[PDB]
Amino acid sequence: PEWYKSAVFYELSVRTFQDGNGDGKGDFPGLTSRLDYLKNLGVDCLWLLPWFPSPLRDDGYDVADYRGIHPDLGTLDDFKVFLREAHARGLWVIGDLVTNHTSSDHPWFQAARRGPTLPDGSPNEYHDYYVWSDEGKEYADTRIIFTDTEVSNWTLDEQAGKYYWHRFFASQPDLNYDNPKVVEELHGAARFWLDLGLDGFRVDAVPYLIEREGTSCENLPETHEILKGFRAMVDREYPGRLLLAEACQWPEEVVEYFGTEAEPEFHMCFNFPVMPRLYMSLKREDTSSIREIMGRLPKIPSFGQWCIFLRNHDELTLEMVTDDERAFMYAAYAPDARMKINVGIRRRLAPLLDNDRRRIELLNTVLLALPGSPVLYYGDEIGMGDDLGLPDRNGVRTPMQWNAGTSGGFSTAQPSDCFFPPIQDPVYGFGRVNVQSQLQDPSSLLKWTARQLELRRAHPAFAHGDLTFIETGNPAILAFTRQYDGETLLIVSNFAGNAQAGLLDLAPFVGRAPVTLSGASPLPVVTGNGQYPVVMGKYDYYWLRLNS
Amino acid sequence: PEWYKSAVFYELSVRTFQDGNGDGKGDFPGLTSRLDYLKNLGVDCLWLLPWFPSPLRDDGYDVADYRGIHPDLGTLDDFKVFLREAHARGLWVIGDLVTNHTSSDHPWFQAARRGPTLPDGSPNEYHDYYVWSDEGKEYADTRIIFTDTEVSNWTLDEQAGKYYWHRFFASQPDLNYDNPKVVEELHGAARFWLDLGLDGFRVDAVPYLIEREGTSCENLPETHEILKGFRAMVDREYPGRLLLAEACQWPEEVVEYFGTEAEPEFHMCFNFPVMPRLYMSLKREDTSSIREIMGRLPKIPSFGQWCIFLRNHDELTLEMVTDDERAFMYAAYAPDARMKINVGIRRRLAPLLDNDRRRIELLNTVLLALPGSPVLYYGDEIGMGDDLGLPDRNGVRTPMQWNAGTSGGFSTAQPSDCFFPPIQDPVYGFGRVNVQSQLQDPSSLLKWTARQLELRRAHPAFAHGDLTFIETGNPAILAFTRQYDGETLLIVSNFAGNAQAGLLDLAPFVGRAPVTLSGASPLPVVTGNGQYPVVMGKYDYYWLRLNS
Ligand SMILES: [Ca+2]
Ligand SMILES: [Ca+2]
Ligand SMILES: [Mg+2]
Ligand SMILES: [Mg+2]
């Protein structure tokens, strides 16, 4: 099976991981010097956030050169050293392809804004690279994604005297994918990095590629068309490489980004639909929305694999939940208005869960036990907090906390000279929360995460097995089976904060012997009608094997 | 009924708790300013470690003046203000009465080592306050308690040309309790403090008052008589004041330090027999130990109440335990040789349990649920560690860690200037383990301990009920009821580090529904023959209520 199906992912920003020269910004030489840490954590694949030259108006997602390294982060040779040294340890590394839009400082758009026709006689080839409007009335009935900061997806450009389109900030003008010249430009930027030996791409914001008047301008077939062209190129020209899609839509729409077996698209998509339902189910102590939303995801093609996660560099997004659910999630997890941003919640995993390690453990359990490949977000393995006095989603991207020395070992610059300030409070600051202390503590959250990934890595049914929900008689208790290659695991999880009893329907497995995955503690044989009484402590997780 | 039966005790030492004036030594003004903290934690009664003038060769337990305040800790003035502010918060205060022995620098031993008769001709009435011999040959068949330091319980005095008796250090000569003037002198010392409003005394080294030839010199009939007369004096004269006794012995001998209804002795005694079995059942994952030794405890008088603890200012003592049990304890809990001392182990609780919060919560659960009155060792509520670079048993008496500031908030003197250095290592140092942090953390151990304590006081069967073990089918699971005034608690505890199944024998309670104590979540009703199946996750505790 493909490497990505068996891999564990780790999402970092090199501007925020490890500063190597005291300017207060993370860089590639600083990341390289930490590769052993990630290896020994149990990670296989590093997903780096954008590293290209950029004014950093959307923290680097507004690219002004698709084929360079941002001068903050080092040189193209620093990048090459880092790639051969990650590969030498057997890590894979994937990039972030920002295909929907460039920065307005990108030279294509400095060219395009001159207008269809140059001051010179001739037509401007670059004008058609972007999406222009005389009045800016097209594509109405089209939501605004960045809702706390933009009032329209059209913006007036003094130079061109026309309107240009942008799904995100005005600093990020959309690329026009109806121009074949733009599709080649994208292909050629991907080739440049694959040629360097990068292992693949997380492709950002795929639903918003093609616009069409009279539609929502999400998930249009033309978009899927272009995406299949990209997969067809990679298949032909770089077999083995991974394309991974960010596509925050509803179950029915997300699954289309795998394409089909006849016409493949992405190898992987994030499982955005479950992520918010995990959090809500913990507050209602009812797990049915996990079962409902999981049950709407169809099966995916053979090459496919879900990517599963709890948090990331962005807001905990609520754009694709019911209106009732979003109101509930705000009251439950954003009690201060400062905690919201756009249509989401800008908080890290530990503070979302009141820093309760029993809860952090339970959720990481469910992350690791669901059909997919897990991606961890840097710092959640040590329980990092957030800095809510920082603009946009930056309070969730503070520097990695390595020890209790200057700026948590991230830099020898002082906290207020760092790009973002490292967190310094009594609960989450680097005095209390850092890698070094957790390397020496036998019962660390970090030690726990490592040992828990070891446990998954010894049981391939987690990566490759099917999934079937067991009836339980108690909505607080979620049980399911993962089956593959003969092995049958049974995962049992309590979303309630006190003891719960359940009655599992194990009728398909009468005569079988449940043992724990850790130390094979035996449990009673499934007998009779297979209805199986269980009791569970607050936030307990049972990882079982049903022996035939 | 009697206030000590229903109280939570907290053991601290003034010198290491809080320094008010910045000389690096804890003082009574500093302790006074922290009474809010202990009141809020849920503590009812402070239990102070010897505060008297001393050369501190055994850390205050070698007393040189029974009626004063050691100048390190302030004046008798400051101690008065302390008792007032404690009492104004509804806090009882008991002291330590060190009764078997005094310091070489006590005026009595100075006067006594001047021979049986003086230079002038008169008799020396002080020579007989202490126990002398000419050859040092009486009382073999007697052990050395400080096996690591002392080779004989006799020690020649250069100046008196005789040997004096001492159970502990040669710096702490044993007082002679065949001399009735000594008894009066102790009643005189106790009344000094009772008269100031102290609420009682723990009496240390109580089993060693009387020596007799041919005998063990422990637990002697004449020893209980002096004690019986101390109880009489107190009851007759300061009624309602508490007498607590440290007596590290086998169960059948410890129970008679209560004496009887006819002849009362102590109100309370430390339950030394069970405490080392909690630790052994954890490692063996086998609670048979605890049940064996609890059944060997005979019933106690009506005024009687056990005092349960996990740890104290001393080594974890293994003297009163089997050779095989001691070898098991050392291998499991003393990996390094200098963690051993005096047939014991000198580590604090959190290091003993590998800093595993699940293991720490579990044993605090059992401390709080066994029948008796619990005593907390200071800093265990936040998870302090120990320092083995300090001699003797001082490694567990580090300054209380209040916040991340200078010397952990214990003093403005910097760490090398403190009486004992405050701990600074990466796992248990004050930058990471401290009170202010855990006040702010919604999910801290300090907060878990306070909540668990107020969950206990809400259910008076813990303090007063009886105890009945319950069959379980699985040695790793301990289960028992506490019954009192028509309330039946049910306590189920998993001492294994993975999931365990049990069959709870609940026949008496058929028809009744087990209800969770935290949140009132109901479990299914006990049907059929009372055989009630359960599963439990690693180190789980269930605190249940049975309702008819
Ligand atoms: Ca677009
Ligand atoms: Ca004596
Ligand atoms: Mg730098
Ligand atoms: Mg002082």
Tab-separated table of all heavy atoms in Angstrom, chain A residues 99-101 131 165 167 174-177 208-211, ligand 1:
chain	number	residue	atom	x	y	z
A	99	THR	N	-2.719	27.534	-4.969
A	99	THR	CA	-3.087	27.560	-6.377
A	99	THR	C	-4.218	28.534	-6.689
A	99	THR	O	-4.342	28.962	-7.843
A	99	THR	CB	-3.471	26.141	-6.859
A	99	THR	OG1	-4.710	25.737	-6.262
A	99	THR	CG2	-2.422	25.132	-6.421
A	100	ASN	N	-5.022	28.923	-5.706
A	100	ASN	CA	-6.168	29.760	-6.015
A	100	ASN	C	-5.800	31.213	-6.317
A	100	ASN	O	-6.556	31.896	-7.023
A	100	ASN	CB	-7.175	29.713	-4.869
A	100	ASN	CG	-8.411	30.516	-5.163
A	100	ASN	OD1	-9.145	30.221	-6.097
A	100	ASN	ND2	-8.629	31.557	-4.395
A	101	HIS	N	-4.659	31.689	-5.831
A	101	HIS	CA	-4.400	33.119	-5.726
A	101	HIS	C	-2.923	33.339	-5.447
A	101	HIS	O	-2.267	32.488	-4.827
A	101	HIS	CB	-5.235	33.755	-4.609
A	101	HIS	CG	-5.167	33.025	-3.291
A	101	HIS	ND1	-4.216	33.300	-2.330
A	101	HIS	CD2	-5.942	32.039	-2.774
A	101	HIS	CE1	-4.406	32.518	-1.282
A	101	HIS	NE2	-5.449	31.745	-1.525
A	131	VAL	N	-8.814	37.881	-12.645
A	131	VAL	CA	-10.247	37.826	-12.899
A	131	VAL	C	-10.823	39.216	-12.674
A	131	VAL	O	-10.855	39.713	-11.540
A	131	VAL	CB	-10.918	36.775	-12.008
A	131	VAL	CG1	-12.414	36.797	-12.161
A	131	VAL	CG2	-10.335	35.435	-12.338
A	165	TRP	N	-11.140	39.999	-8.537
A	165	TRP	CA	-11.750	38.997	-7.663
A	165	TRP	C	-10.768	38.424	-6.634
A	165	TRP	O	-9.580	38.232	-6.913
A	165	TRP	CB	-12.262	37.862	-8.540
A	165	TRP	CG	-12.934	36.765	-7.858
A	165	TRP	CD1	-12.457	35.499	-7.676
A	165	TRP	CD2	-14.260	36.782	-7.345
A	165	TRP	NE1	-13.392	34.738	-7.034
A	165	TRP	CE2	-14.518	35.496	-6.825
A	165	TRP	CE3	-15.253	37.766	-7.261
A	165	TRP	CZ2	-15.734	35.162	-6.220
A	165	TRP	CZ3	-16.463	37.438	-6.662
A	165	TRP	CH2	-16.689	36.144	-6.142
A	167	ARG	N	-11.258	35.493	-3.272
A	167	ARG	CA	-11.999	34.781	-2.244
A	167	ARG	C	-11.505	35.105	-0.841
A	167	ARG	O	-12.285	35.003	0.106
A	167	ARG	CB	-11.916	33.275	-2.491
A	167	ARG	CG	-12.674	32.795	-3.723
A	167	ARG	CD	-14.095	33.383	-3.882
A	167	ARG	NE	-14.975	33.152	-2.743
A	167	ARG	CZ	-15.965	32.265	-2.717
A	167	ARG	NH1	-16.209	31.465	-3.747
A	167	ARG	NH2	-16.729	32.175	-1.630
A	174	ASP	N	-7.272	36.306	-6.991
A	174	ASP	CA	-7.468	34.973	-7.553
A	174	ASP	C	-6.814	34.844	-8.925
A	174	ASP	O	-6.907	35.744	-9.766
A	174	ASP	CB	-8.967	34.659	-7.693
A	174	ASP	CG	-9.562	34.018	-6.452
A	174	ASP	OD1	-9.218	34.489	-5.359
A	174	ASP	OD2	-10.373	33.058	-6.563
A	175	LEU	N	-6.177	33.696	-9.153
A	175	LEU	CA	-5.738	33.302	-10.483
A	175	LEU	C	-6.915	32.817	-11.320
A	175	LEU	O	-7.810	32.133	-10.816
A	175	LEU	CB	-4.701	32.194	-10.369
A	175	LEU	CG	-3.389	32.645	-9.744
A	175	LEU	CD1	-2.511	31.452	-9.468
A	175	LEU	CD2	-2.697	33.662	-10.697
A	176	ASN	N	-6.893	33.147	-12.612
A	176	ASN	CA	-7.978	32.824	-13.541
A	176	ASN	C	-7.686	31.489	-14.193
A	176	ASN	O	-6.895	31.412	-15.128
A	176	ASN	CB	-8.114	33.918	-14.595
A	176	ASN	CG	-8.959	33.495	-15.793
A	176	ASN	OD1	-9.885	32.684	-15.689
A	176	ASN	ND2	-8.635	34.059	-16.947
A	177	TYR	N	-8.354	30.432	-13.735
A	177	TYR	CA	-8.085	29.099	-14.270
A	177	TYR	C	-8.784	28.839	-15.594
A	177	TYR	O	-8.562	27.772	-16.189
A	177	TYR	CB	-8.428	28.006	-13.227
A	177	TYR	CG	-7.245	27.831	-12.320
A	177	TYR	CD1	-7.086	28.649	-11.204
A	177	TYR	CD2	-6.212	26.948	-12.648
A	177	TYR	CE1	-5.964	28.559	-10.398
A	177	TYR	CE2	-5.070	26.844	-11.848
A	177	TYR	CZ	-4.955	27.662	-10.717
A	177	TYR	OH	-3.840	27.594	-9.896
A	208	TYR	N	-12.379	26.706	-4.561
A	208	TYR	CA	-12.637	28.068	-5.015
A	208	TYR	C	-11.912	28.416	-6.311
A	208	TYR	O	-11.802	29.603	-6.655
A	208	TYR	CB	-12.257	29.039	-3.902
A	208	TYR	CG	-12.779	28.571	-2.550
A	208	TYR	CD1	-11.914	28.294	-1.496
A	208	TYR	CD2	-14.134	28.391	-2.338
A	208	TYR	CE1	-12.389	27.870	-0.271
A	208	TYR	CE2	-14.619	27.966	-1.113
A	208	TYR	CZ	-13.748	27.704	-0.082
A	208	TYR	OH	-14.242	27.267	1.137
A	209	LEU	N	-11.435	27.410	-7.047
A	209	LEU	CA	-10.619	27.662	-8.227
A	209	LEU	C	-11.422	28.359	-9.316
A	209	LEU	O	-11.108	29.484	-9.713
A	209	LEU	CB	-10.041	26.350	-8.741
A	209	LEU	CG	-8.817	25.839	-7.988
A	209	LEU	CD1	-8.093	24.782	-8.807
A	209	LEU	CD2	-7.889	27.001	-7.664
A	210	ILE	N	-12.475	27.718	-9.797
A	210	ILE	CA	-13.269	28.228	-10.912
A	210	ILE	C	-14.493	28.964	-10.381
A	210	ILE	O	-15.177	28.489	-9.462
A	210	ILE	CB	-13.689	27.085	-11.857
A	210	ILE	CG1	-12.465	26.477	-12.548
A	210	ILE	CG2	-14.740	27.571	-12.849
A	210	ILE	CD1	-12.118	27.145	-13.858
A	211	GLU	N	-14.776	30.119	-10.967
A	211	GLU	CA	-15.991	30.875	-10.710
A	211	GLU	C	-16.934	30.755	-11.904
A	211	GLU	O	-16.502	30.540	-13.037
A	211	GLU	CB	-15.664	32.345	-10.421
A	211	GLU	CG	-14.859	32.576	-9.124
A	211	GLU	CD	-13.342	32.322	-9.234
A	211	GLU	OE1	-12.729	32.666	-10.270
A	211	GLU	OE2	-12.739	31.814	-8.247
C	1	CA	CA	-10.480	31.189	-7.825
